[PDB]
Nucleic acid binder design. Structure first.
Lengths: 455, 450, 456, 450
RNA sequence: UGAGGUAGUAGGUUGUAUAGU
DNA sequence: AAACTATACAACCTACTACCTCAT
RNA sequence: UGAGGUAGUAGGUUGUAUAGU
DNA sequence: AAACTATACAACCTACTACCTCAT
């Protein structure tokens, strides 16, 4: 008779060598590892956007409560949590009038409006970065809702064309942080945050500190010389332009640092054959990028390299992978998917499965219940009934419990959101964003490898 | 010798701020006495409070909140603090903390007016900074900072009802295994006895055209009633392959590979289920990739079966429940079942726009949880089972397939505790945060709902 | 028997709306206007570079004193003068191995050797700024004595020029600067006698670091509205046998201590035979149009009167090309600043030379001005032997000679690479040489940054 | 023992002004009591305010602002200050401070009217020194018992000078104007009497070949010694121009323009000098564009001309002063003179290398200073002359040019004070400072100098 | 930081190799 | 188709704008 | 963030247009 | 120069790999 094995909740390190489980409570208790002295925030938008940013940046100075701290922990304050400085003064500001917007809105091509508005914001940001002397570490962009309701993605090509100058920025909607007076015709806020102000403050603060340059939290258990290569398989889709395979890759080596290199556009196997079997040259180029960057950042050769993807791996690609890697090291490829259905229902009570349960069907294939009820939060992250992920290793000698606990540890390193956990591992989560940003503009040849310029 | 820091406040009001201050103070080396981490239940509180106040307390910290100036207990604590600070003849004992910006300075009690309250209104970090430098100016003996003790205390007190336990808990899945499979396949080499324009889906029983052969699960005498020319067929030309060899992975011939043997098997399983439950007379829905089904209201008695709730109406809309089945034999010979709910207007016809159906499914999703889902799933499978233990299929006039109506159940080694019903409302609030973190082109279909 | 009419020393604004003539004493007394929260420093060099840099920053953390504060006032420690923190921790270190440098050294070509070191340094800090997480604001590159002597077209100009596109601020510090204790020749005396001016070293380094941080140390006293000062560079580009001509540029100071500085044209016109350094009507129109549009950007109004500073005479066709783009309400003034004219006023009796601010007026369109000499505040002379004046001319236009004298005497007090009381030339021409040398060292620059933190 | 300084200002306003004055006073060596620093939140105010007002304070300061004009604590502290001022019989106990200029002198309360106000309005440094100049709060810091006085004296007494002063002083320049300009500038149209291969450098009088004319300063009948072709040339062919019209710019003819007239005149005055100066048997050192001239050993006696030394000796090289003159015309008819200084190794021949000359010149720069420069230059000018008020120029055999040997003198309305000679050592220190700051490829010439 | 160093051109001289009427 | 004597640029004769060097 | 909605093909079935000796 | 007939990929028969949006 078959049972389900359990994987313990992994720990995340904090300040002074301390470990917790929930990053929100640990942030309220200990604080970040490496400290930054402060950040000067810049805003581009109308005067309404400036006053709304000032009223929030203020509001977030004061402590904000939720209904309870069991699921939605309180916000002690920016300086109390992170130990940095944030104010309403020394804020640079670039304004936009409504004459040009009204005059150009009456055109026939929506894409022309997207182009010229994004270039308006881009050249204002670039000119401020190249003529003004006050240092700006983060640029916060406020968008009016008229262009959202009357006029492919904005921030996608915004970050893509800002990527050649290496400037971090974040996009803030007008209804996000001014929801008090943004209601529909009926009379209720459709973006209602009447209880959720703590989550909004937590997410904004964590994103701002990540774009600041500081490291909020990392993971502890790292054996000497192990690298996880989360291989992007997001498909570029730009019509008759030959998309083929624009695979990218992440790697996590010694901290939460994500050093993502540009995979080749890959003229092999135009999408009539999308089985994604990499030819030796491009495969060894990708592996050589990963290995050389590991050599640069750690000076020692990797003992074992893990590969995360979403499709199956065949023999010629693996033999191409193996020869460049030396005789000592070991390589393993892991496939993660969501489409496989297996839903487990609970006999008594009204609660879901717990996070940490694992189901093994063989040495190669297994399951893992990432989402569900969490004892610490005393709730579940998922909605309705959680859906697991199917994990199978193609070939390579490794322990199944090790890869299960490794993906479970990797699930908690989300930096854009201050949530307990997400379903997919954060390598595959940053996969979609890195692909969308990097294949929104072909015109870049040496993109940066950091993360603050993407999320 | 006195080295303890005393904090007084409203336990169920300033708990958060008091917990933050106590944990930070115990992490920065100052030993702190408070009613959160120490004063648990089951103890006599007042004698210990007085003894610690007037024996080993060197500084007193009263929270001046809106609820911190009318409760009786904080007033009594302040009275005994006034008595002990008059005994010590020291004016640096009562250190007020004011955390509510709504509280005016003229409403505060008389013993707190004379001393200037430490600010905790606009921010807390520099408030802790001035508390620390006032403490070190007042020359309180301190211990070297050791956040490890704070970690141990935080694990000890604040993680009591929020940690998993070791108990056995039983779960049942959506997987239904076949107990009985036909032993052989029947490959029919009809060749010229079939028209070229023959669509194989029109037969009463599963079949697949396969090169020069017609694979099926029934004999050659089955197709007589629809094909007059099949009466001249000889059964010796047909070939048979034992399904034990296929399912055990030991059959690999040049004719049909094992992969295609399993593919043909699962194809006949899938459309055998399709034709079987067409024979039940349960109405159909045009699903995008699979085939979806739903049961008409007015057939089941009381809209009930074994005291279970399956069909209903919420706002002038009768919603129905249904399942979709696809065979998968990769880990085990198991028939899958996936649940979908279907919305009708008058119980006969279907909504023209699929956006309305998607919106109704997502609107009615949150009102129940996996208890109701498990109940409805077992109800649908038990109804589909013309039998009591399994499902009598309809694949052959003779050979049949029997898949049990009970799903496979598994048990886990460790689980959690069962709280009250606040958690489900908080999961509804989780659905609210899922509204509040993502939205895309909702205006037109929301305007079209009325 | 004539007179030298005096011009009062203009003041520089400080924090809390305060003004004091000396920037060092004023900084020690009140402080800068905008307080930055701190800087993270990234260093490229050997282990000795880290040891020397850390020891020097620890030394400048504590207060230090000179022989006398007559010339260089007190240094109360970095926190007590600037208000922001800069300590030994959170310092980013990028490795430099001596094996590859020694292997590259042995080649016969010094040019390929300079090419490979500038490539190495650029590669190191580019992969620092393109994949690392920690924010690095100022990059402190340190070079030892062997590289500085055995590779002697300079390091600094081409380093900054190839760094110009990516918009990174960096500062180059010699090992001789901050290791004067053991920088010893064969005799025994230190080459860099910084022992009595450690306060001066700390003041200069700290002011440069704070300017490269992003905060303005000091502003100007009184600027009349609608008045901007343009200093016309004419740095002679010298790259071998190319069709050479000129590469004129400009510096703009309008309402702040920041100079929006733009790139002039490559100069395919007016060959050195007619090398009297003029502007074509098209190029002059482009130059003044850029000035007018920059004023409209940074002040949201049109300027009333526009100054032009230069080192050579102007003409009539350039001016009637200039005036067709200015609005009719505006007034144009050209100023020529010379240094080679000999006029030495000795003193009949006393213990000092002629003091700063005594100006000699010979006509309304041109006069002398003594921007260098004695000042009653500092109680010493910035010059040596006998100072030399500067000759100021208004080639075209109508204005008051006292006004241009006052404007130049105000403009000569904005040096940012050095914490000095005053300098000889106005800072609009002092910055001219380095901006021209940086822009004319690399051919790949098309639209460069206008902020000044990437040049000094 | 009363030694504290009391600062009373609006609680939330002037916090900067107060905290500044406050700190600066504690850094200068004064014990100062202020609300912001010493009365931190967490303490009692009014009892402590009374205690150090009636026991420990010695000087009372009020910050008079519009915000602090009607703030209750300010006039409460003022009332207790008036009471203690009547107690301890000190009419200068209250030292008011003024920051806000918008208020008049009667809007402040009547307690501040009686006493003088320290000017802190336009700037705070002069206000600080006026506060320091007050009696019972003098430059002597709190009657300092033991130490910590070097930093404060290094701040105050060694940084005294901040303003300027007015006095009349006389300066003499380096310019030497021409007294009696010659009447006629002579042009000799020799045409065919000037050989094509002849050279202007050779003749003993100034001349310029102007197209077909020879523009000289003297008559046409003085060149007989170098060509015998002159006597066939008649003087009426030669034209004459009065120098008044070309000096005033009035002479406008197609032959020579006015600025061309000035250029010709300055070229021949430059030539006329060299010639005469050369006729005075003084040696000659080559320069880049002009020529350098120095006195050899054996001519000047005692190394003293008008009680001024001109030649000298150090190390193993002898140094000789010199000049190089070049005239102009635009501000006045003035001939400039520039100061030069030329070395030698034994007083006969010069250095073979110019780099040694530049190195030794900058070595000798720091040894002397401005009065020595003026002395050497003026002694050189008087030695060049033969009369007492001009210099005889050998322009022709009949016409002499007289140039004012006395340098032009100017006077200045504003001046400075004359300090002692320590600042000369400071200036040589500054020369060493410029040695410490700028240096470029100095190793080779320093190694080769020995 | 300023005084001496070299290359060689601001603006009118007269020596080369053609052509205006 | 060719007489008289200037042109057509243009190298070069005493002088003014720059870049590089040395050293306190 | 998860479940419905949608274009398009694994990989070996059988119809287009030959050419092989 | 020509008998048989599969040829040499190729159009496509039911279901696997990723997208993408509708709202909680």
């Amino acid at each position: 008779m078959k049972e389900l094995i359990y994987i313990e909740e992994p720990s995340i390190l904090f300040a002074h060598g301390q470990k917790c489980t929930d990053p929100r409570d640990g942030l309220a208790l200990f604080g970040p590892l490496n400290q930054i002295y402060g950040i000067k925030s810049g805003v581009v938008g109308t005067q309404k956007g400036l006053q709304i940013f000032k009223s929030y940046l203020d509001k977030i100075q004061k402590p904000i409560y939720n209904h309870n701290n069991i699921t939605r922990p309180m916000f002690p304050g920016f300086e109390a949590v992170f130990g940095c400085k944030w104010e309403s003064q020394n804020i640079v500001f670039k304004e936009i009038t409504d004459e040009e917007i009204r005059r150009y809105l009456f055109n026939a091509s929506t894409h022309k409006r997207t182009y010229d508005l994004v270039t308006l914001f881009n050249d204002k940001i670039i000119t401020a970065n190249k003529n003004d002397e006050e240092r700006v570490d983060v640029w916060f962009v406020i968008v009016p809702e008229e262009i959202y309701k009357y006029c492919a993605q904005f921030h996608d090509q915004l970050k893509a064309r800002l990527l050649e100058h290496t400037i971090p920025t974040q996009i803030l909607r007008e209804s996000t942080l001014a929801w008090r007076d943004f209601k529909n015709t009926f009379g209720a806020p459709i973006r209602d945050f009447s209880k959720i102000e703590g989550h909004l403050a937590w997410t904004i603060s964590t994103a701002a500190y990540y774009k600041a340059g500081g490291k909020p939290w990392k993971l502890g258990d790292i054996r000497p010389g192990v690298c996880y290569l989360g291989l992007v398989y997001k498909k570029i889709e730009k019509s008759k332009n030959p998309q083929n395979a624009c695979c990218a890759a992440q790697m996590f080596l010694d901290n939460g640092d994500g050093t993502v290199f540009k995979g080749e556009v890959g003229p092999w196997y135009n999408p009539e054959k999308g089985e994604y079997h990499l030819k030796p040259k491009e495969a060894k180029a990708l592996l050589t990028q990963a290995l050389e960057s590991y050599k640069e950042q750690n000076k020692s050769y990797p003992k074992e390299v893990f590969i995360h993807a979403r499709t199956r791996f065949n023999d010629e690609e693996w033999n191409a992978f193996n020869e460049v890697t030396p005789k000592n090291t070991n390589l393993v490829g892991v496939t993660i998917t969501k489409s496989k259905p297996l839903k487990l229902y609970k006999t008594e009570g009204a609660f879901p499965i717990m996070r940490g349960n694992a189901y093994i069907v063989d040495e190669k294939k297994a399951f893992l219940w990432t989402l569900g009820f969490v004892p610490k939060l005393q709730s579940t992250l998922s909605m309705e009934v959680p859906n697991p992920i199917f994990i199978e290793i193609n070939k390579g000698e490794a322990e199944i419990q090790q890869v299960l606990k490794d993906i479970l540890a990797l699930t908690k390193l989300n930096y854009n959101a201050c949530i307990y956990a997400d379903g997919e591992p954060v390598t595959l989560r940053f996969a979609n964003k890195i692909g969308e940003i990097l294949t929104a503009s072909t015109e870049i040849k040496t993109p940066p490898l950091a993360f603050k310029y993407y999320i | 010798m006195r080295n303890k820091i005393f904090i007084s406040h409203a336990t169920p009001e300033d708990d958060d701020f008091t917990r933050w201050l106590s944990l930070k103070l115990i992490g920065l080396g100052y030993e702190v006495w408070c009613d959160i981490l120490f004063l648990d239940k089951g103890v006599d509180f007042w004698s210990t409070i007085e003894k610690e106040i007037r024996e080993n307390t060197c500084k007193f910290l009263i929270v001046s909140s809106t609820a911190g100036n009318k409760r009786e207990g904080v007033l009594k604590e302040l009275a005994v603090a006034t008595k002990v600070k008059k005994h010590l003849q020291d004016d640096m004992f009562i250190i007020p903390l004011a955390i509510d910006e709504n509280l005016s300075y003229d409403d505060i009690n008389i013993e707190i007016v004379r001393l200037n309250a430490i600010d905790f209104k606009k921010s807390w970090a520099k408030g802790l900074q001035d508390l620390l430098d006032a403490f070190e100016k007042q020359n309180v003996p301190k211990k070297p900072p050791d956040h490890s003790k704070s970690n141990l205390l935080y694990q000890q007190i604040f993680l009591h009802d929020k940690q998993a336990i070791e108990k056995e808990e039983t779960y049942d899945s959506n997987w239904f295994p076949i107990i009985s499979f036909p032993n052989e396949l029947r490959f029919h080499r009809y060749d010229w006895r079939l028209p070229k324009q023959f669509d194989v889906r029109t037969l009463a029983f599963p079949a697949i055209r396969y090169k020069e052969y017609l694979c099926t699960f029934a004999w050659e005498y089955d197709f007589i009633h629809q094909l007059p020319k099949t009466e001249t067929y000889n059964g010796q030309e047909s070939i048979r392959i034992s399904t034990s060899d296929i399912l055990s992975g030991r059959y690999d011939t040049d004719f049909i590979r094992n992969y295609e043997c399993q593919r043909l098997i699962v194809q006949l399983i899938n459309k055998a289920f399709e034709l079987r439950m067409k024979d039940k007379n349960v109405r159909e829905y045009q699903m995008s990739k699979t085939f979806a089904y739903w049961i008409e209201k007015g057939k089941l008695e009381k809209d009930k079966f074994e005291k279970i709730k399956l069909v209903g109406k919420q706002k002038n809309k009768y919603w129905h429940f249904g399942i979709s089945a696809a065979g998968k034999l990769y880990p085990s010979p198991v028939l899958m079942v996936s649940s979908h709910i279907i919305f009708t207007m008058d119980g006969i016809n279907l909504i023209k726009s699929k956006s309305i159906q998607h919106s109704s499914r997502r609107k009615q999703g949150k009102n129940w949880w996996n208890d109701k889902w498990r109940e409805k799933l077992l109800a649908f499978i038990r109804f589909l089972s013309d039998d009591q233990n399994a499902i009598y299929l309809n694949v052959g006039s003779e050979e049949k397939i029997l898949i049990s109506n009970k799903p496979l159940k598994f048990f886990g080694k460790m689980s959690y505790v069962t709280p009250s019903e606040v958690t489900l409302e908080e999961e509804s609030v989780l659905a609210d945060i899922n509204n509040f973190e993502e939205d895309t082109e909702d205006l037109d279909e929301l305007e079209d709902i009325e």
